[PDB]
Every structure is written in C-alpha cells, then in structure tokens.
Amino acid sequence: GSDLTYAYLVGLFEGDGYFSITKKGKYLTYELGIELSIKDVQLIYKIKKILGIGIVSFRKRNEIEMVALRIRDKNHLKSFILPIFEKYPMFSNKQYDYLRFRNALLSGIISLEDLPDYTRSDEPLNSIESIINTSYFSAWLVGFIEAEGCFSVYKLNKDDDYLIASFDIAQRDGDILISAIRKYLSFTTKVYLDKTNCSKLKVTSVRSVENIIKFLQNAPVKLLGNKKLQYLLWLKQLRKISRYSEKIKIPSNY
DNA sequence: GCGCTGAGGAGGTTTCTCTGTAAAGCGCA
DNA sequence: GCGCTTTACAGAGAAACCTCCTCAGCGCGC
Ligand SMILES: [Mg+2]
Ligand SMILES: [Mg+2]
Ligand SMILES: [Mg+2]
C-alpha cells in the first residue's frame, strides 16, 4: 500500500529488524533481516510483497517457531533498500547501523580487514521536536508499534474482577525516542528507566487508551500482522469493561 | 581456474513484549 | 478507612536480535 507504507516498513524494521555485515570465511555478508514469531508468517509475506525482494526462512529453536526475511543481494540492497532508508530515515541510534551499513556497502568493502570497526553509539541523533515534526512520523509509528507495542488486559488483583487494559512500548537507549512518543500521543505517565538503560512507557487510563485508539484510526496506514490481531482482541475486551466503553467510541472495521 | 557471490543453514545473546505488585490519589461518607 | 481508578516500578522469557559457515554457480580470461 501507500508511499508511507514504506515509512511504516522502516518503523517495523527499526523495532524488529537488523542491518548486519558478517564475516563469511574470507568475504562478507551484507544483510537486512527481520525475524519474527511464526504468528507473523503472513506479515513476512506481506513485507516481501511490498519490497519485491528477500529470502524467507523457517526455524524451530527447538520449540519456539520463527520466520525470517533476509535481504542479502547487494545490487538489490543498493537499488531498493538504501533509498527507502534514505527517504524515510530511522529516528533512533539504530540509524548508526544503517549509516555504517550504507558506507561499507557503497565503498565496496568485501573483506573483514577493510571493514571499519563498529561500535554503535548510545547517544541519540534527533531531538523530541525533530522526531515529532517530520512528515512521515505517524506512519513510522504504526510500524514501530507493529514491532514494539503491546496491547494487554489483566486483573488488578487475583481476588477481584477489576481489569486494567494497557498499552506499553519500550526502547533501549531510547529516552528521546520514547519521550517523543509520549509527547506526540499526549501521554503523561513517567517513563521508567531500568538496570539496562531500557526506557519503558506504559498507559492504562481511559483518556490514554482513548488517545492510542484515536491515533490508529486517524494514522495514514494501519497495523498489518499479529499486533493488528492483538489490537482487535484488546478492543474486544474493551467493549466489556465499563469505564472504557462508556467513555470511548471504540470499534470500526480494523 | 579463480575470485567472489548469496541461498540455505544454523549457533549465540538479549531487548523488548506481557503481565503484573504494591501503593496510592480522588471523591464521597 | 472504602469504591473506583490510575501509576511507579519491575521481572520472566519468548520473541527478537546478532553472528558465522558451506557450497553450487557465475563471469571472466590463460
Ligand atoms: Mg526493537
Ligand atoms: Mg524489538
Ligand atoms: Mg515485536
């Protein structure tokens, strides 16, 4: 779909993918990969359908089932992948990976010896304002949600029937990123920093739940895979929790 | 024959997802 | 000292992420 479905794909690749250059005996593998749960096989084929390229693979890691999409053909990466990531840049320090990948690829580095040593900085490239004000952000955000968002419902206490209903999203070395999301979506809950510099944003209130629901109705593109399914079953649950349904215009198709 | 390729395959570590627990603010009594 | 509702904090492990190898086969020219 859309031109901004490509922006959605960069968000999804930012959340769940990886750029990598790996030794291959005497030479190199340049790759862009995403490996998802088998719950997401249909989305893997929607991604290949959008890009027109990429090898699909299955893995059983002995009881967890996994699907990958991997682009390794260097002419295809130069032609089709870099431009997407030029036109719609990643917002986080995963941009450092695209920049080293792009520089290596375009310089024609083919041996480990000529490959510059890479350590990905923890320091952000953008500000809140710079993230929030770019034209493609909301479309990026649907894919980043596709990758990293969580919609859940849970009992507040074992003994009662009081249900919570939360949306939560996290990123390591992601103060700015996550705060930008908080800002844009008018969330006011405190971002939590854990032992491993992973910033975590979680919301529960009626108004915040009303805010993400409204953002995803009005966003340029929609959720496509298993998060889309998680989104609909959450909504299902939401229609039967009084505080939410008697204050939110919930449903739709999608 | 030779330099180099990527599909197909797989070993290794950890960031997110998902679901809370404990504590409390609001308002009413 | 109680319904209802929200939030600061955080743990487990599945779902992400990161890394390397073999071997047909290609596109040249000795
Ligand atoms: Mg991620
Ligand atoms: Mg992730
Ligand atoms: Mg994910």
UniProtKB/TrEMBL annotation:
GO molecular function: DNA binding; DNA nuclease activity; endonuclease activity; RNA binding
Keywords: Endonuclease, Hydrolase, Mitochondrion, mRNA processing, mRNA splicing, Nuclease
SUPFAM superfamilies in alphabetical order: Homing endonucleases
UniProt-listed GO biological process terms: Group I intron splicing; mRNA processing; RNA folding
InterPro entries in the cross-refs: Homing_endonucl, LAGLIDADG_dom, LAGLIDADG_Endonuclease
GO cellular component, one term: mitochondrion
Subcellular location(s) of the protein: Mitochondrion
Domain Homing endonuclease LAGLIDADG per the UniProt entry, residue ranges: 9-104, 141-236
Principal subcellular localization: mitochondrion
Family note: In the C-terminal section; belongs to the LAGLIDADG endonuclease family.
Listed name of the protein: LAGLIDADG endonuclease
The organism's taxonomic lineage, starting at the top: Eukaryota, Fungi, Dikarya, Ascomycota, Pezizomycotina
